[PDB]
Amino acid sequence: MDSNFLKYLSTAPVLFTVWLSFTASFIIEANRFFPDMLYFPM
Amino acid sequence: SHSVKVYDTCIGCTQCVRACPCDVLEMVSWDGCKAGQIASAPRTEDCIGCKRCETACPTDFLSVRVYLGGETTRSMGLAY
Amino acid sequence: SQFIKPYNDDPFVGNLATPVSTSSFTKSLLSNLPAYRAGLSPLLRGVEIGLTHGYFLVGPFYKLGPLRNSDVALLSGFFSALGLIIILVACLTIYGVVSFEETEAKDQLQTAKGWRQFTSGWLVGSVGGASFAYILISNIPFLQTAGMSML
Amino acid sequence: TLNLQIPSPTFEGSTGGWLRAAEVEEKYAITWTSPKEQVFEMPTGGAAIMRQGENLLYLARKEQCLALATQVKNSFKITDYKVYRIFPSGEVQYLHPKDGVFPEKVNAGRVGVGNVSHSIGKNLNPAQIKFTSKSFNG
Amino acid sequence: WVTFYWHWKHVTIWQGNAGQFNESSTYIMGWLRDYLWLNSSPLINGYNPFGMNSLSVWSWMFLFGHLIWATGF
Amino acid sequence: VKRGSKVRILRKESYWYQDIGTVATIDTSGIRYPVVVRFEKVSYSGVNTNNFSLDEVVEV
Amino acid sequence: KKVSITVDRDPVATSFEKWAQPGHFSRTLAKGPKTTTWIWNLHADVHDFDSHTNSLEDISRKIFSAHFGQLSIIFLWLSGMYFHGARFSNYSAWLSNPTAVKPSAQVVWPIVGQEILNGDVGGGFQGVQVTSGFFQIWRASGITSEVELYWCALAGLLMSGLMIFAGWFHYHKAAPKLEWFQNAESMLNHHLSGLLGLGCLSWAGHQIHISLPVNKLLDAGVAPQEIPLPHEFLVNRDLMAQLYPSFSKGLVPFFTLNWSEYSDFLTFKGGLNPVTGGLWLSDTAHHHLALAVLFIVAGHMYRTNWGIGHSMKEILEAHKGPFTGEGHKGLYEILTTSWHAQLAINLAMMGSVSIIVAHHMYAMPPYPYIATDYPTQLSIFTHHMWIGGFCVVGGAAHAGIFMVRDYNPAQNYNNLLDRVIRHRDAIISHLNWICIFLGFHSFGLYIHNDTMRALGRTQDMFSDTAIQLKPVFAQWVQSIHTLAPGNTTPNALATASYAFGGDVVAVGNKVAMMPISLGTADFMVHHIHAFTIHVTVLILLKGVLFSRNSRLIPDKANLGFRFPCDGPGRGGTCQSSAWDSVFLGLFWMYNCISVVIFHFSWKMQSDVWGTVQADGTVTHITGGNFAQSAITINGWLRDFLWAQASQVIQSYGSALSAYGLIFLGAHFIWAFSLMFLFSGRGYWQELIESIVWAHNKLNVAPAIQPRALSITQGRAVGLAHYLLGGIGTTWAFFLARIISVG
Amino acid sequence: EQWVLNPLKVKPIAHAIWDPHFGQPAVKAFTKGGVSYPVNIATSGVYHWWYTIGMRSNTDLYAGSLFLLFLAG
Amino acid sequence: MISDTQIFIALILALVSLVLAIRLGRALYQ
Ligand code: CLA
Ligand code: CLA
Ligand code: CLA
Ligand code: CLA
Ligand SMILES: CC1=CCCC(C)(C)[C@H]1/C=C/C(C)=C/C=C/C(C)=C/C=C/C=C(C)/C=C/C=C(C)/C=C/C1=C(C)CCCC1(C)C
Ligand SMILES: CC1=CCCC(C)(C)[C@H]1/C=C/C(C)=C/C=C/C(C)=C/C=C/C=C(C)/C=C/C=C(C)/C=C/C1=C(C)CCCC1(C)C
Ligand SMILES: CC1=C(C/C=C(\C)CCC[C@H](C)CCC[C@H](C)CCCC(C)C)C(=O)c2ccccc2C1=O
Ligand code: SF4
Ligand code: SF4
């Protein structure tokens, strides 16, 4: 891995997009496998 | 006519006089700063109020101050 | 061969000498208009201008007014034109009151007495021209239908 | 003094020039000397060609004259320009440079106008000077 | 917002159809459709190509407001 | 105050009031504001140095 | 020779170092951020190449390679559209039944209940209905299978890769010199004869050799799976000659100028195909072939290495008269030195061409089964209208940028530009007066008619059953164009379009095209259009002509193209730049195109689009309400805005509910835009001061000092969110309505 | 005096209309409230307030108007 | 109902109020 390419990958827009997509993928897979969670189940 | 004041925080960098489009300010002799000069406003009847001098001033909160007052033909920038 | 020149041989005044602005036809037409024609009192300038404008003021009110499909269309149009004439005369009066200081000079339009004479002439000409237009449309059936009487 | 007989730069005319207030209220004049005949931009819009030698020009506003002065100073290295104010009565009032030395350079005899002997944060609150003709500066 | 809430609730109670407010006020599309669009019908029919009635002045004034508001922009 | 010292500003109108700067030069002549102070935060006009009097700077 | 190839080899090394240094292109920005303003400046001025360096050669190389990058993106988009048509579409079922199968080329995943958007579009398929018109294009091109669409997608991907490789090569490895870019004559010759001419010739070849037999078999009722492959149409001359017997004569009639033998597959029939409702493909094949001939002839005009050809500088300098001084002298230098002038001209022309495309494509449907696809027609008209308006305003903007930056008065003495500048006051005053006249005698007619209908005086209105404003000139032009076949166009079988007059072309009990009558309401709305276009011209031209100086600011050119103001002085000089004139002209372009598309939607829904039933009567979508309702603002408010928004607000719980969501969301964002538009920087900066105090209390203040957005950025953000909100609202309303009722 | 007798069926009139820009259908459509001239239907609620506080006829309304004219003077 | 004389009395009182309002406006204008 070229260090300049890694430093470019460490910039705010790239990391922002990657982190928000990663978070969205967590929410999407959680709602795919555990849908319709209006509430915390008792 | 607008009122232009120069406070003793002026460092005599002559930027406000160079930024003036209407030849309102000029540099006069002074002993309060290392440059040995302070800005002055003898010709505020020609002041349009553009505040280019205030934009040009480098001292933390400005040494030259423009207070807009009564509007005249010169101060309104009217070519008519 | 340049057709556009600086105005009055002054290149720095805010105007240009063009064929539309400064040709012989334009100068003749402007100098022969009553507002600029030499040898006229302000009263007669007012009379001519008022006759023309008051004469043409009758037409739209007669042809397009709310009473245009009634038997009193011409009378209503002339009365509306007269009311517009009175409003414009009031406009002239207040303009002359606020625009000029009281001077001995009375042979120019831009004096107080000259503008008062011009306003008086404009009122008298406007009433006369409106009445003439009323007479002509009242007495000629060609003007009552605006040319469909030929068909 | 303003020599009225100085020839003007060759201009084809424009609609941007001075209005009736120039001949009725006040008018401005700028003179300068050029080493050669060269094309400059008019401050009112358009291109004119200034002649070699002296040039006199009439404007409606002081700022237009000083804009032209700044333009010829930074584009043609002309600093000898003089700006005058002319009234309809014919009195000519010399404006720029007022004492012959440009205002960004210190000259002896100049007195400070509008100078305040404290910082701007030491101005008075309005409540001291309400119903009183005392200035907010102190 | 206050007058929209007051008027929509009071119209739905006065109509005997308070359940329409109870089911439609929880989302914005209910406010846009069941209050704004639904109650606009007699207002925009104050005058039409078929006639006019006593609401027409409000039908004018409504449009008047839509004009003058825009002029402020 | 001396050269190199970290000082807090007590000028009310200043952008850097109660903030910390570094003294860059102390002028010895009779100047009303002889203390040049350089700041790490830029002002709204983009400057980062200003002159202050002796009473407008306190050592931290 | 004078036209030659000059290239510098390896001018910029290919490296990732500057990728890690944001703001490297700007000396001001390369120092690094100190405020949040820096970030916005970094993303706002990045492709403004002329402000980073003074060398025209590097700017031109950057422009060439950025154009290659855009072409790569466009090819990737096209390849995506072909692939999504190939794999996620109902294209074969649409090919079997065009009149009953809704086109759909987008399928959603089921995640949170959004699978409800996969509506029943027919053909045993569920997906999002598409209105881009790709199905009709592929039917016109002769694509009968999804395998061909897969191959088209592969070709698009290969061309995208080729374009991005060409960009990397032609910037980073072999960059052309400035002398290579400054050949206008060679560029026009090659782009007229090779790009447009050979492109038209090869597409005429494809139309004649592939599109015509496949579409002739499709219109005869043959199923697509039994239609022969295109290469079989190439090699089997008998198979072609059963359909077009002139192919039995070969290329001998072409070279012997016996061209009328080819009259069966090169026609000038006009009108529309009765089976499909589109233009005859033979007419299009002759059309593109004639365009190829004309473009290749036009591509030999300009002077090159050999002595033949015209010199454009000589042509420009020769055209001068007594009214215009030096005439067109100096424009060749302007257009061969300033990129911004070329961008202005080309953006203006592309916008006008897009508008012409929108008009001429609704009126003369060129594709099979696109006329009765009312959502596709409305979508492509509205989309290309908006693109055209945006490109025209961009041409004005970049003209203003040329005027501020690249204009030199020394090289522009007493030419047309100088004289235009020298009577700018007359131009703007006369245009301002005619704009006020147009506003009064167009909008006051609507206000007057609203008042008269509100006052109960129907006989005092401007209508066809009241005092009439008859569009006699446009009706006369329509009569001439209806009478044109056989009288002034003796070789035309039918009219160019039925919108001028004629029969009702209907396909599958839906109106393909019918005559579009023009009455008082059409008069008023066309003069409203003229009013809005003249006011937009007033704003943009006033901004361009006063970009360098004015009576207010004599040194406006020193401040630049884009500055917020010159201070509160002279009474206030806010929004004095040409950029702010573009900022207002974008709003007025939005208003103009909005009124145009509203007129279009209502007039087609009321007088053109509808269903044909027994005894030949046409039942329109809104029942012919345009004539009596489009004369008042109340009629527009009730019978167009209120009436047709029923479909988007009752779309919840159906497949079109996303449009309703987008409807609300656009309604949100547009209003959010006014928060930027109505407010000012100082309030937000002091509020940010308080928030900075709050973050300082917890020692969590960022090193990059937060600042409010600039005044210019406040205007730009408000304008961008305003345009997005308005265009999205019209988008959702139009699409939901026309999918539901058409 | 008509509204006091039947408060829940008679539409309260605010003031009369005299607008010469009206056509005849606008004159007809604004003729409500049991009178023979165009009127505006009151929304200010002055009828209910004045009826509740003990006014019944038109005479005491005029006397109150006179008293407030005198008080303003 | 109200008669013509009552309306005339109200008009006279309104004219008196007009005179008083003119006097107050002149007093406030100094
Ligand atoms: C006949 C030769 C020829 C052709 C076809 C083109 C074509 C083009 N030039 Mg161009 N150009 C030429 C000669 C030619 N040029 C010469 C001689 C000069 C120097 C004076 C220039 C200088 C020049 C500049 C400075 C610019 C262009 C640009 C463009 C593109 C315009 C955008 C567009 O419509 O793309 C869509 C049209 C297409 C045809 C898409 C396909 C794109 C590829 C490259 C076409 C390749 C065709 C190939 C030669 C034949 C294979 C076809 C078949 C046999 C398989 C277009 C691809 C602009 C651009 O975007 O540059 C990137 C631009 O800025 N040209
Ligand atoms: C042929 C097309 C074209 C080209 C090549 C250019 C090129 C240029 N323009 Mg120009 N322009 C164009 C079209 C074009 N423009 C059009 C059509 C308009 C009218 C709207 C303008 C208006 C315009 C102005 C007003 C200005 C320029 C400027 C510039 C220069 C710098 C641009 C820059 O750095 O932006 C960098 C790129 C960006 C800032 C990205 C912009 C992103 C936009 C605003 C948002 C897109 C929204 C998206 C489509 C939808 C998302 C919604 C979703 C979230 C729901 C550059 C020379 C500026 C300049 O300095 O010139 C010297 C300048 O002041 N242009
Ligand atoms: C609906 C709101 C609205 C209206 C009515 C106007 C009206 C006007 N704008 Mg404006 N504008 C608006 C919104 C509006 N704007 C918005 C939202 C923007 C946002 C960017 C702008 C941006 C803008 C720019 C940038 C420009 C204008 C210009 C103009 C003028 C064009 C001349 C014209 O059409 O005269 C016709 C007048 C009208 C249509 C107004 C209605 C008048 C009708 C006929 C009824 C008249 C009734 C009568 C006078 C009443 C008398 C009663 C008595 C008691 C007084 C005009 C004054 C241009 C201008 O001034 O140049 C000439 C110009 O350059 N505007
Ligand atoms: C062309 C349009 C038009 C015009 C000019 C009028 C004119 C009029 N209508 Mg009307 N009307 C119209 C269309 C129109 N209508 C339509 C289409 C409808 C729908 C059917 C109606 C419905 C309607 C009703 C229902 C009523 C009227 C009434 C009136 C009259 C009000 C008299 C009045 O109080 O004057 C005085 C005007 C005012 C007090 C308004 C001015 C307020 C100003 C702007 C506020 C600011 C003032 C400020 C201090 C500056 C002072 C300036 C100084 C010069 C004074 C007047 C004759 C009313 C009536 O008959 O009353 C007698 C009435 O009840 N109209
Ligand atoms: C057509 C032409 C083609 C196109 C181009 C074009 C140039 C624009 C256009 C020209 C156009 C336009 C500009 C046409 C020019 C038009 C004007 C409107 C003509 C006005 C004529 C007034 C005459 C009749 C009357 C005077 C009244 C008489 C004396 C009075 C009798 C009264 C007097 C006081 C005495 C007492 C009795 C009474 C009755 C009271
Ligand atoms: C806003 C501000 C402005 C400046 C002043 C201010 C106080 C600071 C304030 C103004 C405020 C408010 C207070 C102003 C409100 C003011 C007044 C009350 C306006 C009333 C006008 C009444 C009209 C003229 C008359 C009808 C009488 C006519 C002549 C009678 C005929 C009569 C009838 C038929 C019977 C027969 C006898 C005759 C005589 C023939
Ligand atoms: C609201 C507003 C602001 C405030 C806008 C602030 C300063 C900028 C907001 C940008 C944010 C930080 C980026 C996008 C917001 C995201 C939704 C969440 C932030 C993500 C962080 C990690 C950055 C102005 O600066 C302004 C200036 C001139 C006229 C009007 C206005 C104006 O109306
Ligand atoms: S406001 Fe403008 S004109 Fe006045 S002193 Fe400052 S720079 Fe000069
Ligand atoms: S710009 Fe400010 S510091 Fe410089 S001379 Fe003028 S007042 Fe003094």
PDB file of N, CA, C and O in Angstrom, chain A:
ATOM      1  N   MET A   1       0.816  -1.210   0.000  1.00  0.00           N
ATOM      2  CA  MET A   1       0.000   0.000   0.000  1.00  0.00           C
ATOM      3  C   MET A   1       0.852   1.264   0.000  1.00  0.00           C
ATOM      4  O   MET A   1       1.647   1.489   0.915  1.00  0.00           O
ATOM      5  N   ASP A   2       0.691   2.068  -1.051  1.00  0.00           N
ATOM      6  CA  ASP A   2       1.331   3.375  -1.125  1.00  0.00           C
ATOM      7  C   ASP A   2       0.817   4.284  -0.015  1.00  0.00           C
ATOM      8  O   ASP A   2      -0.394   4.391   0.206  1.00  0.00           O
ATOM      9  N   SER A   3       1.750   4.924   0.699  1.00  0.00           N
ATOM     10  CA  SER A   3       1.387   5.758   1.842  1.00  0.00           C
ATOM     11  C   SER A   3       0.608   7.002   1.427  1.00  0.00           C
ATOM     12  O   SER A   3      -0.244   7.476   2.189  1.00  0.00           O
ATOM     13  N   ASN A   4       0.870   7.533   0.230  1.00  0.00           N
ATOM     14  CA  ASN A   4       0.119   8.693  -0.240  1.00  0.00           C
ATOM     15  C   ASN A   4      -1.317   8.313  -0.582  1.00  0.00           C
ATOM     16  O   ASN A   4      -2.250   9.082  -0.321  1.00  0.00           O
ATOM     17  N   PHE A   5      -1.512   7.117  -1.146  1.00  0.00           N
ATOM     18  CA  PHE A   5      -2.859   6.626  -1.417  1.00  0.00           C
ATOM     19  C   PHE A   5      -3.620   6.358  -0.124  1.00  0.00           C
ATOM     20  O   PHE A   5      -4.824   6.621  -0.043  1.00  0.00           O
ATOM     21  N   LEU A   6      -2.935   5.817   0.891  1.00  0.00           N
ATOM     22  CA  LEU A   6      -3.561   5.613   2.195  1.00  0.00           C
ATOM     23  C   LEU A   6      -3.927   6.939   2.854  1.00  0.00           C
ATOM     24  O   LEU A   6      -4.973   7.048   3.505  1.00  0.00           O
ATOM     25  N   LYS A   7      -3.061   7.949   2.719  1.00  0.00           N
ATOM     26  CA  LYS A   7      -3.350   9.267   3.277  1.00  0.00           C
ATOM     27  C   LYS A   7      -4.524   9.926   2.555  1.00  0.00           C
ATOM     28  O   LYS A   7      -5.327  10.630   3.179  1.00  0.00           O
ATOM     29  N   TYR A   8      -4.628   9.718   1.237  1.00  0.00           N
ATOM     30  CA  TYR A   8      -5.805  10.174   0.500  1.00  0.00           C
ATOM     31  C   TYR A   8      -7.060   9.443   0.962  1.00  0.00           C
ATOM     32  O   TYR A   8      -8.131  10.048   1.083  1.00  0.00           O
ATOM     33  N   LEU A   9      -6.950   8.133   1.203  1.00  0.00           N
ATOM     34  CA  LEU A   9      -8.060   7.355   1.744  1.00  0.00           C
ATOM     35  C   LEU A   9      -8.443   7.787   3.155  1.00  0.00           C
ATOM     36  O   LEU A   9      -9.578   7.541   3.578  1.00  0.00           O
ATOM     37  N   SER A  10      -7.529   8.418   3.888  1.00  0.00           N
ATOM     38  CA  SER A  10      -7.779   8.885   5.243  1.00  0.00           C
ATOM     39  C   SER A  10      -8.398  10.276   5.285  1.00  0.00           C
ATOM     40  O   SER A  10      -8.597  10.817   6.378  1.00  0.00           O
ATOM     41  N   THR A  11      -8.693  10.868   4.129  1.00  0.00           N
ATOM     42  CA  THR A  11      -9.314  12.183   4.076  1.00  0.00           C
ATOM     43  C   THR A  11     -10.752  12.129   4.582  1.00  0.00           C
ATOM     44  O   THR A  11     -11.393  11.074   4.583  1.00  0.00           O
ATOM     45  N   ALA A  12     -11.228  13.282   5.057  1.00  0.00           N
ATOM     46  CA  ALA A  12     -12.587  13.396   5.584  1.00  0.00           C
ATOM     47  C   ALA A  12     -13.720  12.956   4.645  1.00  0.00           C
ATOM     48  O   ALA A  12     -14.630  12.269   5.138  1.00  0.00           O
ATOM     49  N   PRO A  13     -13.769  13.310   3.345  1.00  0.00           N
ATOM     50  CA  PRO A  13     -14.924  12.850   2.543  1.00  0.00           C
ATOM     51  C   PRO A  13     -14.944  11.352   2.285  1.00  0.00           C
ATOM     52  O   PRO A  13     -16.018  10.740   2.346  1.00  0.00           O
ATOM     53  N   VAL A  14     -13.783  10.745   2.023  1.00  0.00           N
ATOM     54  CA  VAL A  14     -13.717   9.313   1.743  1.00  0.00           C
ATOM     55  C   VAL A  14     -14.089   8.511   2.984  1.00  0.00           C
ATOM     56  O   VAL A  14     -14.915   7.590   2.926  1.00  0.00           O
ATOM     57  N   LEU A  15     -13.486   8.857   4.123  1.00  0.00           N
ATOM     58  CA  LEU A  15     -13.784   8.173   5.376  1.00  0.00           C
ATOM     59  C   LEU A  15     -15.215   8.438   5.827  1.00  0.00           C
ATOM     60  O   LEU A  15     -15.862   7.548   6.387  1.00  0.00           O
ATOM     61  N   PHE A  16     -15.712   9.659   5.607  1.00  0.00           N
ATOM     62  CA  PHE A  16     -17.106   9.993   5.892  1.00  0.00           C
ATOM     63  C   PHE A  16     -18.065   9.109   5.102  1.00  0.00           C
ATOM     64  O   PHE A  16     -19.001   8.529   5.668  1.00  0.00           O
ATOM     65  N   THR A  17     -17.829   8.980   3.790  1.00  0.00           N
ATOM     66  CA  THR A  17     -18.683   8.159   2.937  1.00  0.00           C
ATOM     67  C   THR A  17     -18.604   6.686   3.325  1.00  0.00           C
ATOM     68  O   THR A  17     -19.635   6.007   3.419  1.00  0.00           O
ATOM     69  N   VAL A  18     -17.392   6.193   3.599  1.00  0.00           N
ATOM     70  CA  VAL A  18     -17.203   4.787   3.949  1.00  0.00           C
ATOM     71  C   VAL A  18     -17.858   4.470   5.291  1.00  0.00           C
ATOM     72  O   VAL A  18     -18.563   3.464   5.425  1.00  0.00           O
ATOM     73  N   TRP A  19     -17.665   5.338   6.290  1.00  0.00           N
ATOM     74  CA  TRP A  19     -18.252   5.122   7.608  1.00  0.00           C
ATOM     75  C   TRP A  19     -19.773   5.221   7.576  1.00  0.00           C
ATOM     76  O   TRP A  19     -20.460   4.427   8.229  1.00  0.00           O
ATOM     77  N   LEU A  20     -20.326   6.187   6.831  1.00  0.00           N
ATOM     78  CA  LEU A  20     -21.781   6.298   6.777  1.00  0.00           C
ATOM     79  C   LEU A  20     -22.410   5.157   5.985  1.00  0.00           C
ATOM     80  O   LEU A  20     -23.494   4.686   6.350  1.00  0.00           O
ATOM     81  N   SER A  21     -21.732   4.661   4.944  1.00  0.00           N
ATOM     82  CA  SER A  21     -22.212   3.472   4.244  1.00  0.00           C
ATOM     83  C   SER A  21     -22.130   2.234   5.129  1.00  0.00           C
ATOM     84  O   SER A  21     -23.010   1.372   5.080  1.00  0.00           O
ATOM     85  N   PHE A  22     -21.059   2.123   5.917  1.00  0.00           N
ATOM     86  CA  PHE A  22     -20.873   1.014   6.850  1.00  0.00           C
ATOM     87  C   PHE A  22     -21.960   1.003   7.927  1.00  0.00           C
ATOM     88  O   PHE A  22     -22.542  -0.049   8.237  1.00  0.00           O
ATOM     89  N   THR A  23     -22.282   2.184   8.462  1.00  0.00           N
ATOM     90  CA  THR A  23     -23.371   2.329   9.425  1.00  0.00           C
ATOM     91  C   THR A  23     -24.724   2.007   8.794  1.00  0.00           C
ATOM     92  O   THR A  23     -25.558   1.311   9.398  1.00  0.00           O
ATOM     93  N   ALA A  24     -24.949   2.494   7.567  1.00  0.00           N
ATOM     94  CA  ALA A  24     -26.185   2.204   6.852  1.00  0.00           C
ATOM     95  C   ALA A  24     -26.324   0.714   6.581  1.00  0.00           C
ATOM     96  O   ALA A  24     -27.428   0.170   6.641  1.00  0.00           O
ATOM     97  N   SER A  25     -25.216   0.045   6.252  1.00  0.00           N
ATOM     98  CA  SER A  25     -25.242  -1.399   6.054  1.00  0.00           C
ATOM     99  C   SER A  25     -25.568  -2.143   7.346  1.00  0.00           C
ATOM    100  O   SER A  25     -26.298  -3.141   7.310  1.00  0.00           O
ATOM    101  N   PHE A  26     -25.063  -1.667   8.496  1.00  0.00           N
ATOM    102  CA  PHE A  26     -25.512  -2.230   9.777  1.00  0.00           C
ATOM    103  C   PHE A  26     -27.013  -2.084   9.986  1.00  0.00           C
ATOM    104  O   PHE A  26     -27.688  -3.051  10.363  1.00  0.00           O
ATOM    105  N   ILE A  27     -27.552  -0.885   9.743  1.00  0.00           N
ATOM    106  CA  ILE A  27     -28.985  -0.666   9.957  1.00  0.00           C
ATOM    107  C   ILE A  27     -29.813  -1.503   8.986  1.00  0.00           C
ATOM    108  O   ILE A  27     -30.830  -2.100   9.366  1.00  0.00           O
ATOM    109  N   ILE A  28     -29.376  -1.575   7.728  1.00  0.00           N
ATOM    110  CA  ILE A  28     -30.093  -2.322   6.698  1.00  0.00           C
ATOM    111  C   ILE A  28     -30.097  -3.818   7.003  1.00  0.00           C
ATOM    112  O   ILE A  28     -31.142  -4.471   6.921  1.00  0.00           O
ATOM    113  N   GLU A  29     -28.948  -4.383   7.393  1.00  0.00           N
ATOM    114  CA  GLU A  29     -28.918  -5.814   7.690  1.00  0.00           C
ATOM    115  C   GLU A  29     -29.665  -6.134   8.982  1.00  0.00           C
ATOM    116  O   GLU A  29     -30.304  -7.192   9.086  1.00  0.00           O
ATOM    117  N   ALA A  30     -29.601  -5.235   9.975  1.00  0.00           N
ATOM    118  CA  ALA A  30     -30.372  -5.419  11.200  1.00  0.00           C
ATOM    119  C   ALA A  30     -31.873  -5.400  10.930  1.00  0.00           C
ATOM    120  O   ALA A  30     -32.623  -6.198  11.503  1.00  0.00           O
ATOM    121  N   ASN A  31     -32.334  -4.493  10.064  1.00  0.00           N
ATOM    122  CA  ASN A  31     -33.750  -4.468   9.720  1.00  0.00           C
ATOM    123  C   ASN A  31     -34.141  -5.563   8.737  1.00  0.00           C
ATOM    124  O   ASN A  31     -35.330  -5.879   8.626  1.00  0.00           O
ATOM    125  N   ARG A  32     -33.179  -6.135   8.014  1.00  0.00           N
ATOM    126  CA  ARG A  32     -33.484  -7.269   7.148  1.00  0.00           C
ATOM    127  C   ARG A  32     -33.679  -8.540   7.962  1.00  0.00           C
ATOM    128  O   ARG A  32     -34.632  -9.293   7.732  1.00  0.00           O
ATOM    129  N   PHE A  33     -32.792  -8.788   8.925  1.00  0.00           N
ATOM    130  CA  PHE A  33     -32.871 -10.009   9.719  1.00  0.00           C
ATOM    131  C   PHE A  33     -33.781  -9.879  10.933  1.00  0.00           C
ATOM    132  O   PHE A  33     -34.304 -10.892  11.412  1.00  0.00           O
ATOM    133  N   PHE A  34     -33.984  -8.666  11.441  1.00  0.00           N
ATOM    134  CA  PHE A  34     -34.892  -8.414  12.563  1.00  0.00           C
ATOM    135  C   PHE A  34     -35.814  -7.253  12.208  1.00  0.00           C
ATOM    136  O   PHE A  34     -35.644  -6.133  12.702  1.00  0.00           O
ATOM    137  N   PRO A  35     -36.805  -7.487  11.350  1.00  0.00           N
ATOM    138  CA  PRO A  35     -37.664  -6.392  10.897  1.00  0.00           C
ATOM    139  C   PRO A  35     -38.725  -6.023  11.923  1.00  0.00           C
ATOM    140  O   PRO A  35     -38.988  -6.756  12.879  1.00  0.00           O
ATOM    141  N   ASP A  36     -39.318  -4.843  11.696  1.00  0.00           N
ATOM    142  CA  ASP A  36     -40.515  -4.364  12.397  1.00  0.00           C
ATOM    143  C   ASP A  36     -40.288  -4.231  13.901  1.00  0.00           C
ATOM    144  O   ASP A  36     -41.118  -4.645  14.713  1.00  0.00           O
ATOM    145  N   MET A  37     -39.149  -3.648  14.277  1.00  0.00           N
ATOM    146  CA  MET A  37     -38.812  -3.448  15.686  1.00  0.00           C
ATOM    147  C   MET A  37     -39.278  -2.059  16.115  1.00  0.00           C
ATOM    148  O   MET A  37     -38.497  -1.115  16.253  1.00  0.00           O
ATOM    149  N   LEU A  38     -40.591  -1.939  16.326  1.00  0.00           N
ATOM    150  CA  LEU A  38     -41.161  -0.722  16.898  1.00  0.00           C
ATOM    151  C   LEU A  38     -40.794  -0.539  18.369  1.00  0.00           C
ATOM    152  O   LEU A  38     -40.883   0.579  18.886  1.00  0.00           O
ATOM    153  N   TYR A  39     -40.349  -1.600  19.039  1.00  0.00           N
ATOM    154  CA  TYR A  39     -40.265  -1.631  20.491  1.00  0.00           C
ATOM    155  C   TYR A  39     -39.108  -2.526  20.902  1.00  0.00           C
ATOM    156  O   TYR A  39     -38.623  -3.345  20.116  1.00  0.00           O
ATOM    157  N   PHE A  40     -38.663  -2.362  22.143  1.00  0.00           N
ATOM    158  CA  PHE A  40     -37.764  -3.348  22.729  1.00  0.00           C
ATOM    159  C   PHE A  40     -38.612  -4.474  23.313  1.00  0.00           C
ATOM    160  O   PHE A  40     -39.420  -4.221  24.214  1.00  0.00           O
ATOM    161  N   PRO A  41     -38.474  -5.709  22.823  1.00  0.00           N
ATOM    162  CA  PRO A  41     -39.379  -6.797  23.238  1.00  0.00           C
ATOM    163  C   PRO A  41     -39.208  -7.208  24.695  1.00  0.00           C
ATOM    164  O   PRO A  41     -38.103  -7.523  25.140  1.00  0.00           O
ATOM    165  N   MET A  42     -40.319  -7.217  25.427  1.00  0.00           N
ATOM    166  CA  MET A  42     -40.431  -7.969  26.679  1.00  0.00           C
ATOM    167  C   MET A  42     -41.228  -9.253  26.479  1.00  0.00           C
ATOM    168  O   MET A  42     -42.270  -9.452  27.105  1.00  0.00           O
TER     169      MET A  42
END
